[PDB]
Write a protein that binds this ligand. Structure first.
Ligand SMILES: CC(C)C[C@H](N)C(=O)NS(=O)(=O)OC[C@H]1OC[C@@H](CCCn2cc(-c3ccccc3)nn2)[C@H](O)[C@@H]1O
Ligand SMILES: [Mg+2]
Ligand SMILES: [Zn+2]
Length: 841
């Protein structure tokens, strides 16, 4: 054993030893119990970043822990390869997105390998390969024939200068983010998943996920946004029917989740596209401009509530079917055509949004609910205004005194009896639009024939291969400019036809890759039936919180789709869900005629004062801490951390600095501290072996050990129990590291020089290297080989010796008849050592 710890010598050797033993190349061995630990696979952007390293270290800690406990562990990795990064990198560098992608995959693969992740590389997948995406094209065609995938016209934001379609998040004040030109709303045909047909299943199945964070479940329930409410029809007043046709001349229908407050509606509001708005604005230019400004909007859903609510009165009136009151119709910008009936009632007394709207325009507020003896104030909003469970109706006529649910049913009865409304269930969830006007994505397996219509490609002809010999320019989607791709024969009639040129939303590939890992070379289906039956579902899933809504809902949706196709036997893809925090770092710049400088290119000025540039030496200015990004150039390249300290130090620093959910602050001092602990770990074993070498670890009956060695064995088996619970239950690895640190501290203060002392020392070290192996496997594998000849993974996870956790009875008489023992005896004077104590009073 070499005296000093050198990661560059031991890490490649350990990886070679793990690869040769093929410990991570697992099969459907029904002898060992299966465990499927999955981290979210990355985009092949070029290099690993520290977010990657944190995620895949967390995934590897859990995997190695379960491996040491005798599980058949699958930890697969792969590449989420389609998407815009490759297309933009293609435009900037004049390279094909495929070539750029495969280069990144090779570089990042070697980086992941140098980090020591116990990955089954034989199960590797790349979603941009035809052997992957042929199967989502296949599922597409099956769902398309069933109607779960349909084609319908939709509205998109078109940029006329950049010649591409933009998302709402990419539109700034009506203009494209890069071009700066006014976007144009255009109606074009697109494809959709009917995810709304699975809404009730997606919502209810969330209750099965007892090992999911409650906030993720809450966020998904709110996204689906189911509501049990009431359809209500307000008769149009006889003076307000000018210009309306059909049922819009008869009534204005709205949806409401608060029918118990119908007595308190003081106005109604319609969408800009509602026929009432059209007929009212017919002679009023102000309303026409308000309708136009509404249509021109491009508000993202994460900003719909932050949008200022504006409205204009129309001069039209409707009648409340419960109290006869005449109510004015307003055009409002928060009423969305396509949600419900595109019309809502407003109760400013018991809905906060209605309260602010009515306060802006001085519209009436009528209290109809009371909660306790609370005073109602028509000028200040109070939280109890919106109370449903605790309130009781007032000012509501014969409905006074009822709670929410009995008022709901009573209003439903009155409405249904006179035909004015009925109960209705609604969902905020929209159907999933998957068409993309991009090149670097999975082609849509539809052929357009003017005789046969939209024809799905036959299963024999799949895949539709995306041609990789393409360098996107910058004047529209390249596939629509390639007749060599889109000119084809109809597979129903043989006539001239045109392939679909739009590609699929890249969320589709990540909605099922966890099943493809089960059988990634299966040529006869998405996943082989024997593999899906053995691996079942993912036991542990790790990834960032930014994917808690869309990706997770998509993955759950796809699982139920594949289940209903007969491909899988699970309702839910992920059993346990751990979400990792962000990585943040200080920022630095130097002013321009700012240009942010990377932290690794900077040294800082015993107390730290200021910072300077490394190459030069003249000062730089230090800014605030925030998430690592290209925006402020504060991303710390993990490769430089590997090169400076080794992979074990990188893995230790990220697991010790913060719990997985908390944000991790980059610290040069912290990284050095982790490296010093590994040096200490190395020195502890080395010094131990140099005074005697290895012995048989202490085992069994510890009666006869000294108190100091009994206390060290108590610390050992308490640390083993603590660490085991931090890995398996709390998933809090920083405290597990601290606990091993405390075990080593007590070991250091214990004289382990005797024969029984060496045996307890051997036991302590053999446990501490196995306890740390999931976090720092390279140095622990090396240290274990010097301590013990058995294979580390076959020695197994350390067991807790309950006998070491037990601590080590005298009589006490008063006046004859029934230091250490005197203190407790007086809590019930000469003391015979160990047997009797006598109270001499
Ligand atoms: C399942 C699919 C949809 C996953 C998708 N391919 C993806 O997100 N691919 S990805 O390649 O972007 O990330 C793969 C995977 O590991 C990293 C996690 C990082 C997020 C938090 N973060 C980022 C940073 C950071 C640090 C330095 C520089 C820049 C940024 N610091 N902290 C992801 O959430 C995900 O779990
Ligand atoms: Mg259960
Ligand atoms: Zn045809």
């Amino acid at each position: 054993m070499q005296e000093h710890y050198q990661p560059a010598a031991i890490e490649p050797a350990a990886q070679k030893k793990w690869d040769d033993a093929r410990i991570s190349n697992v099969s459907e061995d029904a002898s060992k119990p299966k465990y499927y630990c999955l981290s979210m696979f990355p985009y092949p952007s070029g290099k690993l970043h520290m977010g990657h390293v944190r995620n895949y270290t967390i995934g590897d800690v859990l995997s190695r822990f379960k491996l040491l406990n005798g599980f058949n562990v699958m930890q697969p990795m792969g590449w989420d390869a389609f998407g815009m990064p490759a297309e933009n990198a293609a435009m900037k560098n004049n390279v094909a997105p495929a070539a750029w992608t495969y280069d990144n995959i090779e570089y990042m693969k070697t980086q992941l390998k140098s980090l020591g992740f116990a990955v089954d590389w034989e199960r590797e997948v790349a979603t941009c390969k035809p052997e992957y995406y042929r199967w989502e094209q296949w599922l597409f065609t099956k769902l398309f024939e069933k109607g779960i995938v349909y084609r319908k016209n939709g509205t998109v934001n078109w940029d006329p200068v950049d010649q591409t379609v933009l998302a709402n998040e990419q539109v700034i004040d009506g203009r494209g983010w890069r071009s700066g030109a006014l976007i144009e709303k255009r109606e074009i045909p697109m494809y959709y998943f009917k995810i709304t047909d699975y809404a009730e299943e997606l919502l209810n199945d969330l209750d099965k996920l007892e090992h999911w964070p409650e906030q993720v479940k809450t966020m998904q329930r709110n996204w689906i946004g189911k509501s049990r409410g009431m359809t209500v029809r307000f008769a149009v007043s006889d003076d307000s029917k000018q210009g309306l046709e059909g049922d819009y001349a008869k009534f204005l229908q709205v949806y409401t989740t608060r029918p118990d407050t119908l007595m308190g509606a003081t106005y109604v509001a319609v969408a800009a596209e509602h026929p009432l708005a059209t007929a009212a604005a017919a002679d009023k230019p102000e309303l026409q401009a308000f309708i136009a400004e509404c249509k021109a909007g491009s508000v993202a859903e994460a900003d719909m509530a932050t949008m200022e609510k504006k409205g204009v009165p129309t001069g039209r009136y409707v009648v409340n079917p419960l109290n006869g009151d005449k109510l004015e119709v307003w055009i409002a910008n928060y009423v969305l055509w396509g949600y419900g009936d595109g019309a809502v009632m407003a109760v400013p007394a018991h809905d906060e949004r209605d309260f602010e709207f009515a306060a802006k325009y001085n519209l009436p507020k009528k209290q109809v609910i009371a909660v306790g003896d609370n005073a109602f104030d028509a000028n200040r909003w109070q939280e109890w205004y919106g109370d449903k469970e605790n309130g009781v109706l007032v000012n509501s006529g014969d409905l006074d005194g009822l709670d929410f649910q009995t008022a709901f049913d009573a209003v439903a009865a009155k409405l249904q009896s006179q035909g004015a409304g009925e109960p209705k269930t609604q969902y905020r969830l929209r159907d999933w639009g998957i068409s993309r006007q991009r090149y670097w994505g999975c082609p849509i397996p539809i052929v357009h024939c003017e005789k046969c219509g939209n024809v799905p490609v036959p299963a024999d002809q799949l895949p539709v291969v995306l041609p990789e010999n393409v360098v996107p320019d910058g004047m529209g989607s390249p596939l629509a400019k390639m007749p060599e791709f889109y000119e084809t024969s109809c597979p129903c009639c043989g006539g001239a036809a045109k392939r679909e040129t739009d590609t699929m939303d890249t969320f589709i590939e990540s909605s099922w890759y966890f099943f493809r890992y089960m059988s990634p070379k299966f040529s006869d289906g998405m996943v082989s039936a024997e593999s899906a039956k053995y691996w079942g579902a993912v036991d542990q899933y790790i990834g960032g919180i930014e994917h808690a809504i869309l990706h997770l809902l998509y993955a759950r949706f796809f699982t139920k789709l594949m289940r209903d196709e007969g491909l899988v036997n699970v309702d839910e893809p992920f059993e346990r869900l751990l979400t990792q925090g962000m990585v943040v770092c200080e920022t630095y710049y130097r002013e321009n005629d700012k240009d942010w400088i990377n932290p690794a290119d900077v040294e800082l000025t015993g107390r730290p004062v200021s910072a300077v540039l490394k190459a030069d030496g003249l000062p730089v200015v230090i800014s605030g801490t925030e998430k690592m990004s290209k925006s402020k150039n504060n991303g710390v390249d993990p490769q430089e951390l590997i090169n400076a300290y080794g992979a074990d130090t990188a893995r230790l620093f990220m697991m010790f600095a913060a719990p997985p959910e908390q944000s991790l602050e980059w610290s040069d001092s912290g990284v050095e501290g982790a490296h010093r602990f590994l040096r200490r770990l190395w020195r502890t074993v080395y010094e131990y072996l140099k005074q005697g070498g290895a012995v048989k670890a202490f085992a069994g009956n510890q009666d006869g050990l000294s108190k100091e060695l009994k206390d060290l064995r108590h610390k050992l088996h308490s640390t083993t129990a603590k660490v085991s619970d931090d890995y398996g239950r709390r998933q809090q690895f920083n405290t597990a590291i601290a606990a091993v640190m405390e075990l080593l501290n007590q070991y250091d203060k214990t004289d382990t020089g005797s024969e029984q002392g060496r045996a307890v020392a051997q036991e302590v070290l053999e446990a501490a290297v196995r306890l740390l192996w999931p976090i720092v496997p390279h140095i622990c594998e090396t240290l274990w080989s010097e301590l013990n000849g058995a294979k580390l993974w076959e020695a197994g996870w350390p067991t807790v010796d309950e006998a070491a956790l037990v601590k080590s009875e005298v009589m006490v008489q008063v006046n004859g008849k029934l230091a250490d023992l005197e203190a407790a005896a007086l809590a019930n004077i000469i003391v015979v050592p160990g047997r009797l104590v006598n109270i001499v009073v």
